[PDB]
Symmetry: D2
Subunit: 334 residues, 4 copies
């Protein structure tokens, strides 16, 4: 009674799950089989991503992430989620071998089933941390229950936020990253202005003054906590002010041994956001090719990027020399 391949993979279920509605209603359409397998393969891969993402969530929730031995496992699993998403984006290439005209021969047999009825796609969006401030009454029972759990349980965004708030170096009576960054950027701007004013009155000099004033407003706006809370409340920002500070600390001090793998995490979170919006864009394109002129387009935006704040740290890049120096004491803490 040894283990057999087919039994191990429950192929008696996986390979007996293919029912063409076109056939069930006496008008078998060959390409319907493709439509079915493609969706079943997406849903297996959605199940794998939920498996990886729930395991990473738990490592944050149960405090194991506090032990930095576990940062390799956390980054390898998040990196794995992006490798799967890359395959899922490539996988539209298969459904592009189906013409609009052959889709047209079986689409009537699909009504009224909706993509909005993909539980796992909703679970994945909620568990990464997509805003509810955007419906979703398409579910009932055990399914409607899993959705509610996914809505109330801590999102990856919330768990990363809490961990970013504990980033070493933010302590005002320690390294005091924020205090020193505000000072160096202020002095840096004052120096850059004096350099600029010393010049003769060229139109070049006017385009420099105007560039300086733009730079000054953007960089100093980083230190406006009221502005951050206002933008948080409008949904344009997602991380707490202190989590923003921790992310920037990891960005600027990425080479410090304790920050190396955390920097790979932040990168991988941005990759997952990029690949999800590539998924949504290839899908929008697929729908247009099939139905022509005839909400999905609205989902291809920064509104749906959970880690929008990680992207927007590029806005606040400063000359390398303005970054507060690490002395031997804080070099060795890191």
């Amino acid at each position: 009674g040894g283990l057999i391949y087919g039994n191990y993979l429950h192929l008696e279920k996986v390979l007996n799950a293919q029912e063409l509605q076109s056939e069930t209603k006496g008008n078998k359409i060959h390409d319907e089989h493709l439509f079915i397998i493609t969706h079943q393969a997406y849903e297996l891969w959605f199940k794998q991503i939920l498996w990886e993402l729930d395991s990473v969530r738990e490592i944050f929730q149960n405090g194991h992430v506090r032990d930095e031995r576990n940062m390799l496992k956390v980054v390898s699993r998040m990196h794995r989620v992006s490798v799967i998403l890359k395959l899922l984006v490539q996988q539209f290439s298969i459904l592009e071998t189906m013409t609009a005209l052959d889709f047209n021969d079986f689409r009537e047999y699909l009504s009224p089933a909706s993509g909005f009825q993909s539980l796992q796609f909703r679970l994945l969006e909620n568990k990464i941390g997509v805003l509810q401030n955007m419906y979703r009454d398409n579910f009932k029972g055990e399914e409607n229950e899993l959705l509610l759990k996914s809505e109330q349980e801590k999102t990856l965004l919330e768990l990363v936020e809490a961990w970013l708030e504990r980033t070493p170096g933010l302590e005002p009576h320690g390294f005091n990253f924020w205090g020193k960054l505000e000072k160096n950027i202020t002095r840096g701007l004052e120096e850059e202005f004096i350099r600029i004013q010393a010049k003769e009155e060229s139109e070049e000099k006017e385009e420099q003054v105007a560039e300086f004033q733009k730079q000054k407003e953007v960089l100093l706006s980083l230190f406006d906590e009221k502005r951050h809370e206002h933008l948080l409340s409008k949904g344009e920002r997602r991380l707490s002010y202190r989590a923003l500070q921790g992310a920037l600390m990891i960005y600027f001090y990425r080479e410090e041994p304790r920050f190396q793998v955390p920097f790979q995490l932040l990168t991988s979170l941005m990759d997952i956001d990029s690949l999800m919006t590539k998924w949504r864009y290839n899908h929008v394109c697929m729908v247009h090719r099939m139905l022509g002129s005839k909400y999905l387009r609205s989902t291809v935006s920064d509104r749906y990027k959970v880690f929008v704040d990680l992207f927007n740290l590029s806005t606040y890049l400063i000359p390398r020399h303005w970054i507060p120096k690490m002395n031997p004491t804080i070099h060795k803490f890191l």
Copy 2:
């Protein structure tokens, strides 16, 4: 009301994941990826079988005789290669699993094997892999009951190789009464080889010249061996070739006159059959490299990455018999109009 989950029978697809590591109270995280990865391969093997069997059926029932159906044949065979190309990239997901982590659940797999993939064997058999082509360690002893019944059917029913062969034997232009391609081709290669021997013999005695002589003499042996039907039967018997002499003629006719309207899509079909063989071999290669990365030290698998498992090896080997454009027999207005839709 038809519902997404019900339409796709997700109550089966998403309730088919059972970790043996967990079953035996030592749940290993990466076993889940091992299961999903294979299940995804097996969904796509089923889709390939669906395309492939539909194309076999279009040859078998004679609908292929009506050239309206060539676009459908080429789209479905191209679709098979687009699927296989994703299946080759899909290994990159299993590469995110280290040897160390695989080693933690590996023992719970024994003794289930890849040889027990029914669909992989159905797919090999239906393209046209013969028992004689296969290396042992016999493949059918891994199966029983209705699975053993389906495999037998896969060996006994007409393969894509056989159905393509029958269709290539009927390629217009081969008829000795008509365009008489083979006769004109032998004439023009014999004539072209004579003109070439003459150009070379004209050159001043130099090491370069003697290098061109020996190059010509081997080229002359290769090109003229094309017309040796009994050399062809000998290569059939050793398994170095698979297509009938007449099928080989039909292939080479489509190859040289590809731009003639009636041959445009048939040329794309010959191209897709090579693609399918290349991508099956690339699958075999990535699978071998995957096993090496996970186990270190298998020799059977390395054997499978060779022309012995390429069903349409003859279509690759037509490149061997490339000649100068001007040697290709010219077409008169009557044979031009016969190759027009």
Copy 3:
């Protein structure tokens, strides 16, 4: 003896890498990646223009009229889409450069601009992006980024026949449109009038259920969509507003190929229409990947102009895509009799 390096002119290609950061005394490692990446895109843009110009010529010199040339036209157009697929994947190399590292050398690039890619503009023009339909960046015409010989080539590329115009002309001559022959358009209008009446009658026989109420609104929209197809005045209006590109007769040609693609003479022509949509869709994906790249490097107008290029405006063969709108059940399609089946 011809040598590999001499044949490939590697003495030019591999001596064209000058880091501006090094030239001004502060060598930044990653600028070398920035340079190779662009040089690789520009070689491939040259290859695309070589394929594209060869196909334009085949239409322009009348060789396309001999249907034996269709395999060459479709292989070269398929080749263009295979290159564009690689160019889309090539962003993944430049994604290994972090915003912090790009920031160390961006100052040395000023004021060089992607707007100054001559090959990218030639490519857009030759496919058939019209200058009067371009979004202006910084309130200016794209051609004022260029002077002298380059400005002149761009003008030739705008004035010379575009791939859209040549395909348009070829589509106008599609067999089956002749009113005194198969009379495609006439038979299509009649079959759609009929199918619609038959569909109305099936629906009005279904109580007054909310499902029936829905099918009535849905029927009403499809009827307006399908019968607007036959309104040639509405088409000329949309042609002038640039919301369409193909002549009314070209649209008929395309829909003739779409519906009768399995007919032997239409099989490779259908592959050409597919490949033109592929090129549009892959140029849009390039524009999309470039936009995402600009965001990753600079954060959050220039970010908005690039977003404006990821739209149906810049899809030269948008009409081929929009034929999906005019899909009808297979049995409404005019049947082919033995006379036109054989032609």
Copy 4:
């Protein structure tokens, strides 16, 4: 003011395309594809050499000893992997050239050879493909000089070897990894119709690890490449990858295997490409072998995988030494 075309020296890059078929008054369309494809490979080979040299130099000049440099080292080796992946995919473009169309211009290529790609040889050498396991007649002048430098200057393999030898945990008077590992395996192998056969061959595999003389013999054959102490370093990083100081080192070892795999995948696609165009030179089939895998020792550590319970447990004092 700086211009895009001048910054990129397009006046050189886009004026380097000479069809030999055209030069001899029989212009063959597909020859342009053949030239651009090779030019793109060579731009990318140049980028790989730039990355690979910067990494070699970080080892050679001692900066790798400062562990803050490990992110930079793994980023750039990962970048090499990503480029090599594009180059494997890039064969897809030359696959749009039929054998027949190649046949129309291949005569005008003779006698230029692939063996004359300088950068490809520079690349193989700098990584550390050994000469005794294999080309240089095909070059003269400055090119022949650069090839000698690339054979004589320290390879990536040599620099990685040196660095692996200093891997903390090997010191006999410290954690004594090798000592404790030999102990635990032998004690673990203590064990109680059947298939007792597997146990025996298994025992021989595991214990052959501790045969330093076997290793030196295989080292001289070129069937192994890493010094015995390098192999101890490597295995330490493998078993203790989670330890903070080993996490990025483990990524680097993975990247080095990735590069071997992708170079072989390039060799394999190239071999298929030759077979597609010329039919049935296949010396190239020999190059698709572990003989040409510089980091074969890193791949082979999978053979010496043991039950976790046997891996020497780590005490707090060494846990703290590995941060």
